[PDB]
Design a protein around this ligand. Sequence first.
Ligand code: ATP
Ligand code: ADP
Ligand code: ADP
Lengths: 48, 361, 355
Amino acid sequence: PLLHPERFVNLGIEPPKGVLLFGPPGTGKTLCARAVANRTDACFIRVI
Amino acid sequence: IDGRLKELREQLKELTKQYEKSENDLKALQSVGQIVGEVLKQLTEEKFIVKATNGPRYVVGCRRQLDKSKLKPGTRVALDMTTLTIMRYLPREVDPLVYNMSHEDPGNVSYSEIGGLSEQIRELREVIELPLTNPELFQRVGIIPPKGCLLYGPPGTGKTLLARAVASQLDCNFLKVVSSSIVDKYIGESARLIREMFNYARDHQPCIIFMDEIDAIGGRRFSEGTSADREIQRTLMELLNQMDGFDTLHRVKMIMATNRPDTLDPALLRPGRLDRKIHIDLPNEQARLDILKIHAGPITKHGEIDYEAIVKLSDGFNGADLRNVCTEAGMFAIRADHDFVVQEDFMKAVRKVADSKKLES
Amino acid sequence: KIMKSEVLRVTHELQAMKDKIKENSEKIKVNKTLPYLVSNVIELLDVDPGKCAVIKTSTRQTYFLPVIGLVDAEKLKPGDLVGVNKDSYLILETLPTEYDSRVKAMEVDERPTEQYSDIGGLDKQIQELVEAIVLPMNHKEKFENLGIQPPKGVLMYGPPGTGKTLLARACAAQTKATFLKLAGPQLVQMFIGDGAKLVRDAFALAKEKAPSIIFIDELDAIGTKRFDSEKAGDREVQRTMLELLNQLDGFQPNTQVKVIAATNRVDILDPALLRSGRLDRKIEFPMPNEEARARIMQIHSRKMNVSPDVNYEELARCTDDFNGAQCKAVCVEAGMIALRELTHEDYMEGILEVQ
Ligand SMILES: Nc1ncnc2c1ncn2[C@@H]1O[C@H](COP(=O)(O)OP(=O)(O)OP(=O)(O)O)[C@@H](O)[C@H]1O
Ligand SMILES: Nc1ncnc2c1ncn2[C@@H]1O[C@H](COP(=O)(O)OP(=O)(O)O)[C@@H](O)[C@H]1O
Ligand SMILES: Nc1ncnc2c1ncn2[C@@H]1O[C@H](COP(=O)(O)OP(=O)(O)O)[C@@H](O)[C@H]1O
């Protein structure tokens, strides 16, 4: 969705409505940080 | 002749002169008002202690026209905003503003809107009104006035409608209280709620407490014997011993609009109990045609007065159902977007409601 | 005749006195443009030996402006939030009141845009409730001249996913009138009379804003079937149920502001909310058949153009006991997988995912 290459037409209107990256204490949110780095300046905030 | 428009010009001048006198009273006042306080202490004939509602109390004089007998201690008064002197004394009021009286006397013209069982309405009025009108005679001779009356006919003729209408000769305020709403928690301290509602009636002394549903669904499901055991009956005994709520002094009665008089705790029908019960059932053919006529009253269309044929198809239909019948006739006409309602529309409405109730029963 | 001199005085008097009205209104209106004190009306009807007012200022004081010296007690009833002179200590002009914190805008949508065409399956029921609600909005004068007051209480009972919410918002849009949504399950507040106050101000807002649609959800949650038990007995929520009942009769004249209550099982309610003037139009919302489910998911995926010529017949065969929400989820599961299945096989797993 951040690339916005295909969400509009080929796949239904809007990309998947949500993402719940859960899991036991471990890899959780490291992939989120990696996605933040790989994406644009619209970068995340870690709220608790 | 321009002089014949003098009447129209006169009307215009009167119309604008009403506004002009209104604005004259609005601008001529242009007042700052007086501040509100309470007589904290009279002190003496000349100086008085008046405390504002929000702090400071002052030693002020009194209004010349007023007198100490009109001022009195601990009474709301008005002080001058600047010179700080008593200007006028005002009455005060408090309001609990919660769970108070909801339905009041105005709109009591349903004596003609009931139609059916006018003799029954007359009998209930005969039972209720006289102690409600002049209870002092009951004390004067040493006889206890009745508490209220019982009403049958679970879905039938409007029991609440009768409660509203009969208060026409009563000039009282009917109150629609639910048995469950009065009992709340399943404790004998449910009498607190009855105390509050009886205090509300006492404040609005000319009142009649119309009960909604005491024998919860008397036709089926759970009665007084089933489900809650004796809770309803003890809560009713509370209102029964309330009967010493100054019946001579208090213009309060209680109508019990049960569905079915079957499970009504026969211990509550002895003398000193609810006592009187008036029989209301599904309307007969005569009452049915009469209530059909009064329902059609507001409806002015072509149609016909062929009420008996409608009665034939719609026999044993409650008054609320017949009101729904007239509304369904209007609904059919408007769904057709026809400004006319004929007997065929009535036939369609009657068939629709009959099939609906037949399927639901 | 006398008309010439009479009208010569009449035009001059009217225009000059309206100029005086303008002058007084401006001198009061800049003060009306600077009102500062809240108006807690402790109304005392002091008739001059007509009325009067006690105003509780924001700065904690009492002002007894005589005979309410600018506005009329008919429109000014004992309440709050009506303009008060900061210098003249007088009732200045009315202004909108406060809608009870939560009800100021709980979830009020100013205007729904969902259309009737995108929903369906229960077309007979939807047309019935359209005739019972939207027609009393557009052709209200029709009912007025007929003489039959339209009913207000409509209860959509049926399992979730049957489209009650979409149908209600679409009906409100068709009426082009105000729509107010009530979140029923969260109306159970610990605060005493809190639900009663919420319902009171919700009805007040609906009355103040057009013939509205009061869409109260979870009517089963709101009202119990009076199946009292030792664990609980619906003691407190009965106050709120009675408050709603007493609020149902407020809008009988000028029949406006309709009440729409959504639930799954109608039987969980006592025979008290069900009445001719109260909730009367009890409308069934069943799970759509295969044809209706296929048509609904087709309409939902109408804005998707990826797999041509998918008749959704295998989908209808595989949509056993599914809701409109479930069909939408099935179609958008394809809307999520159909990148780069696709035709007639990217639909089954949507239901399998949820459990
Ligand atoms: N796949 C991974 N590769 C490298 N380091 C990882 C990985 N998963 C977890 N870590 C390490 O774990 C630590 C915290 O990782 P992460 O930020 O994913 O979790 P968190 O926010 O602490 O919470 P939780 O452990 O509950 O998910 C870091 O030191 C990170 O380097
Ligand atoms: N005899 C009647 N005449 C006119 N309206 C009636 C009559 N009986 C019932 N109704 C209508 O039924 C509605 C409610 O009646 P209700 O008091 O519930 O009757 P019941 O208690 O027997 O079910 C009222 O709005 C009233 O208009
Ligand atoms: N006829 C229909 N057409 C399109 N979508 C529908 C239909 N019926 C239900 N839905 C979907 O169901 C969801 C609404 O679910 P909900 O309102 O909770 O169902 P219910 O009103 O039966 O409780 C919406 O997101 C909508 O997409």
